[PDB]
Design a protein around this nucleic acid. Structure first.
Ligand SMILES: CN[C@@H]1[C@@H](O)[C@@H](O[C@@H]2[C@@H](O)[C@H](O[C@H]3O[C@H]([C@@H](C)O)[C@@H](O)[C@H](O)[C@H]3N)[C@@H](N)C[C@H]2N)OC[C@]1(C)O
Ligand SMILES: [Mg+2]
Ligand SMILES: [Mg+2]
Ligand SMILES: [Mg+2]
Ligand SMILES: [Mg+2]
Ligand SMILES: [Mg+2]
Ligand SMILES: [Mg+2]
Ligand SMILES: [Mg+2]
Ligand SMILES: [Mg+2]
Ligand SMILES: [Mg+2]
Ligand SMILES: [Mg+2]
Ligand SMILES: [Mg+2]
Ligand SMILES: [Mg+2]
Ligand SMILES: [Mg+2]
Ligand SMILES: [Mg+2]
Ligand SMILES: [Mg+2]
Ligand SMILES: [Mg+2]
Ligand SMILES: [Mg+2]
Ligand SMILES: [Mg+2]
Ligand SMILES: [Mg+2]
Ligand SMILES: [Mg+2]
Ligand SMILES: [Mg+2]
Ligand SMILES: [Mg+2]
Ligand SMILES: [Mg+2]
Ligand SMILES: [Mg+2]
Ligand SMILES: [Mg+2]
Ligand SMILES: [Mg+2]
Ligand SMILES: [Mg+2]
Ligand SMILES: [Mg+2]
Ligand SMILES: [Mg+2]
Ligand SMILES: [Mg+2]
Ligand SMILES: [Mg+2]
Ligand SMILES: [Mg+2]
Ligand SMILES: [Mg+2]
Ligand SMILES: [Mg+2]
Ligand SMILES: [Mg+2]
Ligand SMILES: [Mg+2]
Ligand SMILES: [Mg+2]
Ligand SMILES: [Mg+2]
Ligand SMILES: [Mg+2]
Ligand SMILES: [Mg+2]
Ligand SMILES: [Zn+2]
Lengths: 71, 42, 111
RNA sequence: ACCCACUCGGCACCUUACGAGAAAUCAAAGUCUUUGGGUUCUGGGGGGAGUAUGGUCGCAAGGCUGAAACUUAAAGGAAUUGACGGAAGGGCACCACCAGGAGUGGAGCCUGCGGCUUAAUUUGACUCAACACGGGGAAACUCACCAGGUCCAGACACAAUAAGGAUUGACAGAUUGAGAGCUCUUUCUUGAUUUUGUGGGUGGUGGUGCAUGGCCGUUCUUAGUUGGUGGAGUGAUUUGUCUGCUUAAUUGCGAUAACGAACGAGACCUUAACCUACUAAAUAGUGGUGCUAGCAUUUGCUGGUUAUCCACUUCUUAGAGGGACUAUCGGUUUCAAGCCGAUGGAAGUUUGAGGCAAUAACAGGUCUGUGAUGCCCUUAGACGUUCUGGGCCGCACGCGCGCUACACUGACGGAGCCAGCGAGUCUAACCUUGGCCGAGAGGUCUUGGUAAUCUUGUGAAACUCCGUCGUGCUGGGGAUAGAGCAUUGUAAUUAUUGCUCUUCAACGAGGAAUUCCUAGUAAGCGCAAGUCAUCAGCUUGCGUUGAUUACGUCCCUGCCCUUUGUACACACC
């Protein structure tokens, strides 16, 4: 046939990091628990799901994308 | 196949035809789902 | 090859066919393909009596080496037709007339 | 000299063949394993080789005599069937010619093919039997090519990873042609469905039509193929299957060691021609009668009218029948199958036209129709697939199928006005009458039709008539090009198509060549169907107009058939 070609630089795919992280809640002394990172307002999110914190952005990931709640 | 054996061709072929008549002649004579969702709906 | 084919011919001949034909095409065990006709008895080819009296199939048999064609032709008894013409358009039957015991003295009958 | 008969001895010939032979053949090649008249000589698988060496003869060239080493399984005879001939003899054919028709070949454009070009210009096919072929009219699709971007749709098994997360997704920005979370940034989400590797799969218009099936083309517009019993032969085989005559035909007659038969041709099937009779039709029409319009007429003519009734089946439709068998008569011949002529007839070229189609052949075409297929290739930076955009149309040129023209048997303008085969729409946009808008192209409101019911009498075109042009590259011709307006489609640029003005080329009948054709044919002409969103200079069918000239030959060409030769049989590649 032809047998190869192309400039250089194969592309990579993705990770999903590592993240031991679903520990974001704060317990005071014995035992009271207060939540970090405010949860989400859509009827598809039972407010067990939270909103990512960037800048401007807070965003719902259980909705795979949808919605912009910005506080 | 080769022309040397052609007799044993015709004889075993004759013999294959008799066994289709024997198999033939003998054969002329011879010898819920949704409801389990409803009853489990408790 | 010939065993199976000959045996199929003799079973269809046994079955009261006017005649039958088995064609094997393709390649058996050798590089170069071949074709073998196996016929017995009476068959016809041209014309509408084909459409009435002969059923043909072809079948692709797919083997470790390759693919063989099998085209089986069977000519049923026309006299047994039971729906269709009962003979070939070729058939012409005269009726065997009689031996006459000749003449008489003329006379007459009365009733 | 000649004739006839006879007889020795000759050169030959003819027929047999009792006999012999592997056979072709042979009065010897016979008088044979029933093996013996006399005698001379030669040969003992094929090569090496008539070579080496010695002897001998020769002026010489060469003669006579004449080994071996080594090598090899066939070489050789006669005959058979095939096959093949730059051999002959017969036949057949408008894919051959004669007599002619219209052309093609020239020109412009249309198209395919080569070539060049190109990131790419995807690829098959190359005499007839490649080149308006792959149903191949490609804007994306198609699509196989090229420039880039995504996705797994990587079954299943084992391993490993891993609930402290195997893995999935994504907003904004970045990025990207792109409102692709491709990838990055950021940090939520998901929950054992994946991920990683091995093994194994899967897909591939990737390869091989020279591994195959299936199909198809071609030999073949052909006429050939086989077997029973009997004859010939040791045999394979042969006769049958043939000189002649006849046919479209191994179609028949006839000749006959053959007789009597089978596949193929024929028959058969479909379709077109004819049925004052069969059975019927508001989904076909006819006459009558009402209702009624217009002319003129004391009447009569022409329309109109989905039922207003009554009758009928000529014309239209399709069931089942019938009819042609070359019939009758006369010619002509083997005194034959046939052939020519006449009359009749719907029809007498197998009535016209087709479908089907024996044995075999080909390295014909096709893995680019197939979830037909072997093997090879590839399979995650994919040859899988999708998306974006180009390409298949690219232009010094060579070739093939065509379309349009060179005009006065015409163009243009009125006017006349006639077909046949077709096809059409429910999750849908098909065929479209009518009504208005528009120079057009088209637009728009309605409508009939799943259809002998509506479009549709598809009011097609050539053609007919009355005029304008008047032989002037002209009012013939319309390539090229500009500007504008519409239609299909997401998308019209390299201009899908359509329309109006303008632009107004070559072409003054086409060299060497070469195609097709015999009667409702050739030729002119349009239509529908296929492709199909749009696009036909293409194809498949259809009807409209409708001739000249053959009713022969074997000169050319092509093929079939005898014979003939062969050392070919993997068959003249
Ligand atoms: C004017 N625009 C178009 C016009 O060009 C024409 O187009 C048709 C086209 O649609 C047809 O398309 C075809 O498609 C169907 C379908 C079943 O495949 C066919 O049955 C039928 O031949 C035809 N209707 C084509 N065959 C002919 C053109 N004149 O007619 C339809 C139209 C929409 O009016
Ligand atoms: Mg084959
Ligand atoms: Mg026939
Ligand atoms: Mg003499
Ligand atoms: Mg020797
Ligand atoms: Mg031909
Ligand atoms: Mg020619
Ligand atoms: Mg001529
Ligand atoms: Mg030309
Ligand atoms: Mg090209
Ligand atoms: Mg062609
Ligand atoms: Mg092309
Ligand atoms: Mg593409
Ligand atoms: Mg591909
Ligand atoms: Mg794997
Ligand atoms: Mg081939
Ligand atoms: Mg064929
Ligand atoms: Mg015999
Ligand atoms: Mg026959
Ligand atoms: Mg009336
Ligand atoms: Mg009638
Ligand atoms: Mg006569
Ligand atoms: Mg080839
Ligand atoms: Mg195929
Ligand atoms: Mg393949
Ligand atoms: Mg394939
Ligand atoms: Mg193709
Ligand atoms: Mg290919
Ligand atoms: Mg296909
Ligand atoms: Mg198949
Ligand atoms: Mg060419
Ligand atoms: Mg062609
Ligand atoms: Mg006119
Ligand atoms: Mg009608
Ligand atoms: Mg009509
Ligand atoms: Mg002019
Ligand atoms: Mg003009
Ligand atoms: Mg197009
Ligand atoms: Mg075409
Ligand atoms: Mg003649
Ligand atoms: Mg040669
Ligand atoms: Zn949300």
């Amino acid at each position: 046939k032809k047998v190869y070609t192309t400039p250089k630089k194969i592309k990579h795919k993705h990770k999903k990091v590592k993240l031991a992280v679903l520990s974001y809640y704060k317990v005071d002394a014995e035992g009271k628990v207060t939540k970090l990172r405010r949860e989400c307002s859509n009827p598809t999110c039972g407010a067990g799901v939270f909103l990512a914190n960037h800048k401007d952005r807070l965003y719902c990931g259980k909705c795979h994308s949808v919605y912009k709640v910005n506080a | 196949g080769d022309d040397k054996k052609e007799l044993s061709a015709e004889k075993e072929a004759q013999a294959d035809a008799a066994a289709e008549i024997a198999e033939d002649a003998a054969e002329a004579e011879d010898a819920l789902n949704q409801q389990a969702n409803n009853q489990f709906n408790k | 090859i010939r065993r199976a084919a000959y045996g199929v011919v003799r079973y269809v001949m046994e079955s009261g066919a006017k005649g039958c034909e088995v064609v094997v095409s393709g390649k058996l065990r050798a590089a170069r393909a071949k074709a073998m006709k196996f016929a017995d008895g009476f068959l016809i080819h041209s014309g509408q009596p084909v459409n009435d009296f002969i059923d043909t199939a072809t079948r692709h048999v797919l083997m470790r080496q390759g693919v063989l064609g099998i085209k089986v032709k069977i000519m049923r008894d026309p006299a047994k037709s039971r729906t269709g013409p009962k003979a070939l358009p070729d058939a012409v039957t005269i009726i065997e007339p009689k031996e006459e015991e000749p003449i008489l003295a003329p006379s007459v009958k009365d009733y």
